[PDB]
Amino acid sequence: PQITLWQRPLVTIKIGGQLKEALLDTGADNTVLEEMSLPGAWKPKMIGGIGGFIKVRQYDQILIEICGHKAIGTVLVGPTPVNIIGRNLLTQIGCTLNF
Amino acid sequence: PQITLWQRPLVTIKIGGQLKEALLDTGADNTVLEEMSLPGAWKPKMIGGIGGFIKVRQYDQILIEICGHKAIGTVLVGPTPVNIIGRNLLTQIGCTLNF
Numbered sequence: 001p002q003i004t005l006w007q008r009p010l011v012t013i014k015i016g017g018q019l020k021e022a023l024l025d026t027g028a029d030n031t032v033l034e035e036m037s038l039p040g041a042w043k044p045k046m047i048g049g050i051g052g053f054i055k056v057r058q059y060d061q062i063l064i065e066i067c068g069h070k071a072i073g074t075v076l077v078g079p080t081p082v083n084i085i086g087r088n089l090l091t092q093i094g095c096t097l098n099f
Numbered sequence: 100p101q102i103t104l105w106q107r108p109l110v111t112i113k114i115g116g117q118l119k120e121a122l123l124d125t126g127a128d129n130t131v132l133e134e135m136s137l138p139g140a141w142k143p144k145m146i147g148g149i150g151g152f153i154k155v156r157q158y159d160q161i162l163i164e165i166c167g168h169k170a171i172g173t174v175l176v177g178p179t180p181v182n183i184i185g186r187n188l189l190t191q192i193g194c195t196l197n198f
């Protein structure tokens with residue numbers, strides 16, 4: 001899939017048995033998900049936006065299906081208004097920018 | 100140019116006679132620039148990211164030279180830690196996501 005940028009680049013994801021919609025976000029170093037139930041141990045973490053900072057729960061080695069592509073990585077969960085797939089996961093699904 | 104996402108997708112911009120580095124940011128609807136001197140009138144604006152909101156100055160129909168591609172559009176100036184080229188300007192340089 002090629003994707004133009006006239007609308008937000010939103011994709012379907014499956015994480016922890018759940019279907020979510022998420023933003024492909026070349027500006028995000030990290031993947032950040034809205035409040036959800038993920039199984040397993042987590043670490044405290046703080047990440048910075050535009051913005052200020054939010055407190056998130058850090059989860060390592062999480063399987064996530066992004067637009068029908070499987071990828072494993074660190075997922076962060078916390079009070080983000082929008083699900084963000086950052087570059088740690090974008091590189092796993094072979095995502096490039098072209099201009 | 101094609102650009103992988105193993106590093107931050109940073110490009111050179113010329114805006115208001117000045118050279119800057121900026122992040123190609125598919126997760127940003129707007130272009131946001133660190134405090135700088137831009138000539139002419141502006142409007143007050145508030146923009147939300149992760150962490151909260153920042154007060155910005157809104158400038159319309161600004162000429163921006165992104166990686167040797169000329170584009171005109173709305174640029175926002177305010178206390179962002181990184182220069183962001185959002186989708187309003189990404190569509191002007193024929194920027195697509197490929198995976």
Ligand SMILES: Cc1c(O)cccc1C(=O)N[C@@H](CSc1ccccc1)[C@H](O)CN1C[C@H]2CCCC[C@H]2C[C@H]1C(=O)NC(C)(C)C
Nearest residue numbers: 027028029030047049050126127128129146147148149181
């Ligand atoms: C989530 C995240 C990380 O995990 C790591 C590094 C940065 C970020 C981060 O917040 N990145 C953002 C750009 S703002 C930015 C600030 C500093 C460095 C790089 C980018 C997102 O790419 C875009 N970001 C995605 C999304 C984040 C939650 C709030 C709604 C949007 C808002 C949008 C945004 O901020 N828009 C502006 C117009 C204000 C620029």
